[PDB]
Design a protein around this motif. Structure first.
Motif, PDB file in Angstrom:
ATOM      1  N   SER A  20       0.831  -1.196   0.000  1.00 14.44           N
ATOM      2  CA  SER A  20       0.000   0.000   0.000  1.00 14.44           C
ATOM      3  C   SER A  20       0.866   1.245   0.000  1.00 14.44           C
ATOM      4  O   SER A  20       1.950   1.357   0.576  1.00 14.44           O
ATOM      5  CB  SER A  20      -0.889  -0.060   1.239  1.00 14.44           C
ATOM      6  OG  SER A  20      -0.073   0.099   2.394  1.00 14.44           O
ATOM      7  N   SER A 112      -6.682  -2.737   0.432  1.00 19.01           N
ATOM      8  CA  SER A 112      -5.634  -1.711   0.408  1.00 19.01           C
ATOM      9  C   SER A 112      -5.403  -1.152  -0.994  1.00 19.01           C
ATOM     10  O   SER A 112      -4.914  -0.029  -1.109  1.00 19.01           O
ATOM     11  CB  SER A 112      -4.336  -2.235   1.033  1.00 19.01           C
ATOM     12  OG  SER A 112      -3.646  -3.151   0.236  1.00 19.01           O
ATOM     13  N   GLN A 113      -5.727  -1.872  -2.053  1.00 20.16           N
ATOM     14  CA  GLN A 113      -5.594  -1.337  -3.391  1.00 20.16           C
ATOM     15  C   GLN A 113      -6.636  -0.258  -3.653  1.00 20.16           C
ATOM     16  O   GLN A 113      -6.402   0.676  -4.454  1.00 20.16           O
ATOM     17  CB  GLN A 113      -5.740  -2.443  -4.429  1.00 20.16           C
ATOM     18  CG  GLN A 113      -4.570  -3.419  -4.439  1.00 20.16           C
ATOM     19  CD  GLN A 113      -4.880  -4.573  -5.378  1.00 20.16           C
ATOM     20  OE1 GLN A 113      -5.561  -5.517  -4.947  1.00 20.16           O
ATOM     21  NE2 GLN A 113      -4.444  -4.475  -6.609  1.00 20.16           N
ATOM     22  N   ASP A 115      -7.753   1.695  -1.116  1.00 26.78           N
ATOM     23  CA  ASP A 115      -7.124   2.795  -0.372  1.00 26.78           C
ATOM     24  C   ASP A 115      -6.099   3.506  -1.254  1.00 26.78           C
ATOM     25  O   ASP A 115      -6.064   4.734  -1.349  1.00 26.78           O
ATOM     26  CB  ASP A 115      -6.434   2.318   0.899  1.00 26.78           C
ATOM     27  CG  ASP A 115      -7.334   1.621   1.899  1.00 26.78           C
ATOM     28  OD1 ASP A 115      -8.553   1.829   1.902  1.00 26.78           O
ATOM     29  OD2 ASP A 115      -6.719   0.836   2.694  1.00 26.78           O
ATOM     30  N   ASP A 116      -5.298   2.694  -1.952  1.00 28.42           N
ATOM     31  CA  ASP A 116      -4.288   3.243  -2.844  1.00 28.42           C
ATOM     32  C   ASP A 116      -4.927   4.154  -3.886  1.00 28.42           C
ATOM     33  O   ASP A 116      -4.510   5.263  -4.155  1.00 28.42           O
ATOM     34  CB  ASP A 116      -3.475   2.143  -3.521  1.00 28.42           C
ATOM     35  CG  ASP A 116      -2.632   1.280  -2.599  1.00 28.42           C
ATOM     36  OD1 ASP A 116      -2.325   1.737  -1.487  1.00 28.42           O
ATOM     37  OD2 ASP A 116      -2.262   0.148  -3.029  1.00 28.42           O
TER      38      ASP A 116
END
Ligand SMILES: C/C=C/C(=O)c1ccc2cc(OC)ccc2c1
Length: 243
Positions: A20, A112-113, A115-116
């Protein structure tokens, strides 16, 4: 995600372990599905310019983004690294240098991708039925929504459509693609479009487009068109499309 075969499973495994990022965005989300609906009401042809550097006429991604900004309803930016030569840093700089909606186009298998994507400035994310179970797709769908990002759900066949509608998808891209060959099955694409409810925003992927095809697909209820090869080879065709 599922366990698949071939380069697609390689990509799934890369995504699983992708770290991340450390970043924060510089402007609010600009909603892509909502902008498509606005273009529809205003009778502006809605084209998503699809960018990649490589896949399983290479262009400067920034320059391409800036070129398309005055005309396109949105941009699709491929951020998968190994097979598409994508980057998070290119997404970040594209998103800070144009003011139209940015789709982060990748193989998303974990939160988390998402979030990215938010932290890098994207306005929404692609989710792919083929590489996820229904439970996973539902959980990533609701995760993206929470941020304010209605994700674009990729379907390749009728089973994929049915899973997308079963979890309440509101924004669908019809690839009808065999990921082993990169084939778009244009026949199946038309069939699938005709099965999507009117209140789901629906976007076929087209490599090339025929004279009349755009008009014929709009008659089938298509809301926007995501166009790849033709615009990479001849970016100026987006002018014709809108004008
Ligand atoms: C979801 C992002 C997908 C693509 O844009 C994409 C582009 C070209 C491809 C070419 C292939 O040939 C082996 C296979 C998959 C492909 C997928």
């Amino acid at each position: 995600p599922r366990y698949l075969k071939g380069w697609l499973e390689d990509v799934v495994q890369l995504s699983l372990r992708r770290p991340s990022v450390h970043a924060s965005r510089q402007r609010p989300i600009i909603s892509l599905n909502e902008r498509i609906l606005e273009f529809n009401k205003r009778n502006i042809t809605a084209i998503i310019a699809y960018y990649l550097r490589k896949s399983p006429v290479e262009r400067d991604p920034i320059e391409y983004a800036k070129y398309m900004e005055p005309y396109a309803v949105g941009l699709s930016i491929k951020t998968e690294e190994k097979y598409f030569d994508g980057s998070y840093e290119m997404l970040r700089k594209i998103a800070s240098s144009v003011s139209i909606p940015i789709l982060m186009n990748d193989f998303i298998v974990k939160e988390s991708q998402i979030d990215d994507a938010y932290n890098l400035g994207a306005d929404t994310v692609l989710l792919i039925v083929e590489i996820l179970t229904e439970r996973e797709l539902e959980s990533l769908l609701e995760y993206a929504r929470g941020y304010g990002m209605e994700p674009l759900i990729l379907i390749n066949d009728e089973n994929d459509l049915d899973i997308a509608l079963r979890i309440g998808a509101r924004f669908i891209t019809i690839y009808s693609m065999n990921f082993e060959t990169g084939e778009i099955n244009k026949e199946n694409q038309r069939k699938l479009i005709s099965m999507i409810p009117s209140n789901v925003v629906k976007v076929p992927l087209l490599d090339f487009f025929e004279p009349n095809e755009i008009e014929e697909l709009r008659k089938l209820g298509v809301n926007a068109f995501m166009i790849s090869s033709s615009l990479m080879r001849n970016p100026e065709k987006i002018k014709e499309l809108i004008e």
